[PDB]
């Protein structure tokens, strides 16, 4: 009844997954910890099973990972690159396999399964360079035969958390990273997509066995939030990389802060799509749409909130409505299929009572709004207007496929709206005014730490650092100067004169 | 009998003082709190009285503040840099005034208190230039069409906590680069320095109001724990640095935490020197005894910890102890003076507790451990040899001048026993060993912020970011790119084409 | 008959000028060389007299600049930015009656010539902070025990050769950056402006001297071509930083060249302005008047070649014909003078043959085109139409106020004509299209080295690196990392381990 | 007769090499210029012929490669990245034939031939993640309502020579910076080397054409002296870089600063070893041992000079001589060898020339000075004592495996002695002195662009700038902001504000 089980499934013994799978990995596989079934959101199928992570199994790991990073850390970063582009090249040999398992396990369609993948690729082809360019400034020192340096050394243990939706990249993120800056990781990744999680690992172990070096450079733990609050509790994880909801993030930064450790949270987020009375509407329509809908609304980045000049209000939702008619749904894995299932049935009805609440604080639900019937957890995407820009339920994170639509006149009070939310991960205004443009991205602009400009919310990629403010957590992952993060300063005078300090009285020698 | 009505100390008139001093500014200078006597610690005479701020002068002096920043954020950078020349300036032309102050209400010696002034007017001078600099790359997008740039802006509103040991040059670090960053500043001294915190705030206010400003683009509100309290937790606030003790930074990082604010925490020392076979003997004795007797053993970079290696250990400790009995003791402001009085009677008590416990512990004390029959609060400098490394009273930072020496015999025992306690400050090694230097510098060498070689745990100059690790709290100030903790950075994508993107089946216009 | 002896100029003699002054510097003041008499082009009378250098007089002030650098160079860089810092004062206390002179003596109006002194005073407060800032990255060496750091250091003399239309701000740019930098300066400035380098160089030289250090560090050797030929030819002149014509700049490249000396190279400019169908026409024409006939038209950045499209051509003209008309003449110390004198009887001859060259070639004097009817060398500003873009007097670099104005129809041709000339200084664009201006300032855009948007052809600040491309010279003065050019690049490997090499089947040892 | 007539040498048609090559590429094979035979170093047997390119073949690839650049350099940098990087991975597949046809045509042994193939392999995969990092900083603007940005955009035309003696790396390094960075090239190799050129063209023309690019991008045109002068020339080719002897290269950056082109030169070398008093002879020995011998002395970075501490000389120089006789010789690709023959026989006529010349300026051969009787150009590896520091033959660098020893006693003469010759490639000291090594490092220190503390002369990783100073030439290749070089830089200011111009007295509108 399993669908490894099945033969239509046999690719999945191309990741090298069984029946039972073990979770955990410290250069040995193991798991003592419950054991976990995932299915698939597509028919609510079991897929395969994976045995989790006990405490002593966590505790026996993060032990061998710190033992790992007397070794990882000697390597000279350059011959750490190395080892990270060979990441590349293995996920590179299993792209499509590794792509159609995300999107069997997690639900998203094929070509963004796939295009996961090649975002953790990329990433660490980027490391490779990188590898050779990490560390600080020699600085003149004020004094006389004296040097000045700043040095970056690795925290050491690097923990990371990371959630369902994107169960390959985010961890990709941080794994090429701080493996370059010389640490060692522990992942624990949502526990339904452990499959996903025990095939990247799987695929990164070999690299390291091939290299003769310890597995535990790269160790995961399956497990859920017992095995995630014994990381944010634990002195041993120097750096926790926490990716999920605000609500967790918050306690996770909390229990770091208090044993004074260090966090980089990436957490929820309110995105909204501004388009002014100039933009060009042939760009905004399909923008709109595809950050609306894409990954069914389950992306971090993904358009929440949609303000329309009020000019162009009526003829921009009429369009979009046009539009949404023609989204074609299917399994992810069904050819040409934009629009999948949400993750969970917890989700559906997440989905339902947010329209449920929209509706009823006022909005119109102009187009979708209901449940598909059919197996899995199939929503319609929505669009609902006439609500307030300061709605409850507008201001709220709801995971699914709904945008709300509000109207505006003037560019002050609509930079405003933007600001106003707790979340400040992504924004994106549509414009052609270059000076409206630069007081955007300006102090009076934008509050969001990324702030786009006729691309919507989910335009990035690795060349940047990506993250949010305010309750989105601050943490940043990926490019510019991230690295850091992952890095501790120091800044070091050497003196290397025979110079002595003044005695000042004191007779000395 | 207050001192600033006696004639010897006229030149406090100098600096804007008066009997009773207001202690809140904002653009008026005003205070409805509690009336506060601050003591001189050499002789504990009341020198003058400061009005401290209730909670309604804190609420006004917030909100006008986070008004003048629509003003000053309008401002570029380059003439707020302008402006930070003045402060600069200002400080210049009322150095030894100013020093004098704080000798007088603070304690350390006169050429200390001058040289904090001038640490203040060299970061003015730096940050005018970093005021034509800051910003991020411009990078290539891999889309064509599209610009990718890095923004940074300022937070809005620094919040800033200082201590009484260097009650000018910690404001001073954070004024000038949130300035220039475009941020307005709260200060909140520590109340037993707060004639300095007005003294100062008189001079930056005669700026800003000769150049036409809103005065509370650098705000004062002189109060104790109630305030500190209100501006951890206040969401105002949108960065809170805070120097000051590790228990209170703990609290204050867990408040921001909790609001998902950002912090700046600069907290508690306890740093080693380490001395090895090869050492400059006549380089080691003296530098270990200006950075432990320095400032009364009051500085977060002092000294507290000597490592010496075993064939060197008793030639280093007596001779250390000769050096000890030469050191001058006196008046701060008294010249040829190398040593004052503590700042605080509690202080005292806590140095003898100190010196009782490290004797219970096993220790010997060779020099000092005792009060001076004098006026002020005035004790031996002390040095206690037998202590274990792990000692309890070696790893508890007590803010006295006591120095706790230990014998080692190798590097890796010696490096680790440095990193051992929870504090993460500064370190130094002293050795001529070209490979030790660089294992010192390196991945398995000192975990600390500050990390110096043949130069004291006191060794940092503007140019480099100051602060430490682990229960330091991770802070930086003054030089390299701190001010990036000033100010928020966004990834900003700009599609500039004519370009629409891919209609995948769908059709739009 | 001199100026400097009439009662009306007795201000002269607070820059410590007389009838004769001396022309080099070196530490000592002298010039065993030839005696010249600058004058006043408002009114063609001589102001005073400078003794130029002879060939034994540059002979000793090398050789005196060189030992000066053993003791400069060892000076650390921040408290050599301590002495730049002090110059910028020095010249703050000056600024009007030296801005005076260069009006007195060069010609350009008041505001521009306090203005120019103002430049050098600011990019002496940047070199300050960046005196702190200067040096490489530490890099991640691929060996295992070794360190690779890239290290700056200074060339050692620097050269530096000016031109009369910029008398203080070019060799303030350099003189600042190189000193910061550790290298001693010779300067030789225009014989027509020898009284500004006499002025300047008495200002730097006290605060020098009151630093106790060698005055050589900033040496003068005033001279015309043989001079500077001199120093283009001479193996002890480390960089020659050269800005005038390009004529003599490629002489001057070639010459150092031969020697594998250094040069940084500031030469002619060819400047458009670009005004697009959609631009905004009350921004282009202010812009354009006060580019083109600002100082003159005697700016390296000055606007020689206006393009407009065919839709609003004749208007453009017309609103400039009629704001051409308004603009006020006069002694360049009347400040309600937007209008100065040229800089020689030579200067006048040379616009009336490009005019009556522009005549010959088919062009329209569509205003002005005669010399004024008044004492001194004043010309009427003029604007010429109908020419064809590549005209010849149009290729033709004419310091004289003079703007070539030509139709265009589409953005493709009108950036090739911008390209199509062998200058390659500056050029803006006037227009609100988004995708036109990063196409603009894109590959396929201007070729020049400063590329503008809605602002004219002299548009920059001391923040960026300011210079062109092409015949130019490709050199850059002021911001950015333009100090890289000033000091010399070494990449650097220190193997600090216990390792040896291996001995591939040879027995060492 | 030819040697890839051979069965021994099939190995060679992997490369796609046959009896004649094409020897010009742009898009199209061809060669209408003379056919050249290049021969094996080691036997001196004819090994296959290239056919050279005419003037017309040189014509034409100039043009298609400069409009193969517009498609180029509208690629995203971070998709050019991605082409590199495939490159990189061709010359993986083939590095073991390649290699073996360095050793083959141009005489170095194998695991250095490998060794040359793999240093282009490693700086593609470094430019991969450069490609996401080029560009310029954002400025803060001393103007309100403008941005101030450094964009960095390419030259178009990279014209790369290259030299025999590193007939694949050096290529490699200036093609995949050149790339990344939007330009095309023109390879023109060394005659002598000419189907090495082909071989590593052939790689890169079909990664080209299997990505549906015109070949012109990567262009090559085998020539001698009549095309090498052509490109330095050319105004169409906007960079040359070139490396090779000095002679040769000060007469290409006279005809490329003659046309106001930009030029990258990697001249000569006379590279000095330093032994201090405190030296480590265990490292000492070797480290001079194979800096001098390697690739029988032809390294640009070879050592030639080597001064040692009156102390240790006669030890150092026994202890040398006994390491040279257990000099492996032999065919370059025989395992075993670890010295092969030079590259002409005109080379081992001025290897004779040089000796001859040694003992006529008093030198003495004390291991070596003469050719070996055998097939090739084989010569024995040479040591000569006695010479003083600025004997005439000893300031001259002979491309020959020739080492001249000096004696010396004091730090000060024998860094002057290393900075005194024309050169300024590379320099190495060895000691255990912190102070002496920071001295070295610094402005009192080596002149060199390579700067090396206890590793030989070729020393050097692709992380750091790769270059010289002074007769060297001044380019940097690889590592570090190199690519800058590559590029152009602009300084743009975007006025986005409505704000119009002060008006200063005129009446516009």
Known sequence: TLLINQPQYAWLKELGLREENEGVYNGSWGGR????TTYCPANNEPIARVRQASVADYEETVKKAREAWKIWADIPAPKRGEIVRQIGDALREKIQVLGSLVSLEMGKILVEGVGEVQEYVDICDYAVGLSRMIGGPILPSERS????????????????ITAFNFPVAVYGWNNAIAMICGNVCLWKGAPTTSLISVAVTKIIAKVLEDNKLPGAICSLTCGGADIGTAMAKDERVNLLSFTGSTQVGKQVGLMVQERFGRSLLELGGNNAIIAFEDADLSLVVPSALFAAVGTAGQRCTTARRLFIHESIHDEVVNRLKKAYAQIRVGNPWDPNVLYG???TKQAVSMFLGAVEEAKKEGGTVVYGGKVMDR??????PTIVTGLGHDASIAHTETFAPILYVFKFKNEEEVFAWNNEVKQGLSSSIFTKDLGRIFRWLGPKGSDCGIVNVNIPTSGAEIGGAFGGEKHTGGGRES????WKQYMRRSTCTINYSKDLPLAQGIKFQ
Chains 1, 2, 3, 4 share one sequence.
């Open 33 to 36: 910890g419950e054991v976990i």
């Open 341 to 343: 299932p949400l993750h």
């Open 375 to 380: 197996p899995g957890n199939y929503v319609e």
């Open 145 to 160: 035969g004296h040097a000045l340096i700043e040095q970056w050394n690795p925290v050491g243990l690097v923990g990371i």
């Open 479 to 482: 490019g510019s100067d991230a």
